Amino acid sequence: MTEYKLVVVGAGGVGKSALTIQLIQNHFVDEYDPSIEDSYRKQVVIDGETCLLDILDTAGQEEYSAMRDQYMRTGEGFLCVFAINNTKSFEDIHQYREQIKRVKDSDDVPMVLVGNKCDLAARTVESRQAQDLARSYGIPYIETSAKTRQGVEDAFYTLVREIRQH
Numbered sequence: 001m002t003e004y005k006l007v008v009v010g011a012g013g014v015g016k017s018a019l020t021i022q023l024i025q026n027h028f029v030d031e032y033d034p035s036i037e038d039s040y041r042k043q044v045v046i047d048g049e050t051c052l053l054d055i056l057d058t059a060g061q062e063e064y065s066a067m068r069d070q071y072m073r074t075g076e077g078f079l080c081v082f083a084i085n086n087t088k089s090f091e092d093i094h095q096y097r098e099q100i101k102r103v104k105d106s107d108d109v110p111m112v113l114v115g116n117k118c119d120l121a122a123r124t125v126e127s128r129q130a131q132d133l134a135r136s137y138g139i140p141y142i143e144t145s146a147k148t149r150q151g152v153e154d155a156f157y158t159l160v161r162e163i164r165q166h
């Protein structure tokens with residue numbers, strides 16, 4: 001099987017853990033609310049290929065993590081997550097992009113822009129605004145809800161496909 005190192009990044013509270021947990025849960029534990037950053041694994045078939053996804057659920061840029069630079073060096077692809085009801089989180093996307101570019105010294109890193117919490121009516125970031133931002137980075141944009149599961153598998157599998165076509 002092929003192993004992929006994925007890193008989930010974004011501002012505090014956008015749903016980085018919720019997304020990761022929704023993908024990787026085997027549901028033995030009913031509720032799991034991770035308090036700090038951690039690594040998770042998921043085996044899945046994507047376009048006929050058996051993949052092992054190593055998924056790193058990072059803390060926001062706000063919190064200190066000693067290993068952050070090495071997480072980014074190791075990471076092969078990045079989910080850049082914001083929340084559609086949090087303008088600040090959307091504006092923060094630039095910070096996360098620049099951090100990844102600074103560490104990896106590259107303009108062509110596999111990424112997916114993720115607008116999470118799309119189950120919510122109180123939207124402050126229009127899809128067209130995020131599509132515009134994604135198009136300026138030359139990356140896919142996908143809207144997700146970690147509550148409903150909408151788009152969650154698609155976001156991760158799109159990232160794997162970006163890594164592949166790199």
Ligand SMILES: Nc1nc2c(ncn2[C@@H]2O[C@H](COP(=O)(O)OP(=O)(O)NP(=O)(O)O)[C@@H](O)[C@H]2O)c(=O)[nH]1
Binds near residue numbers: 011012014058118145
């Ligand atoms: N309505 C809604 N709430 C969501 C969604 N995803 C996460 N949340 C909620 O938003 C809050 C933050 O979720 P969490 O997964 O902790 O986000 P985080 O980005 O990992 N936070 P941290 O940076 O502190 O680790 C929680 O109350 C969670 O239930 C979603 O898709 N929809």
Ligand SMILES: [Mg+2]
Binds near residue numbers: 016018036
């Ligand atoms: Mg978290």
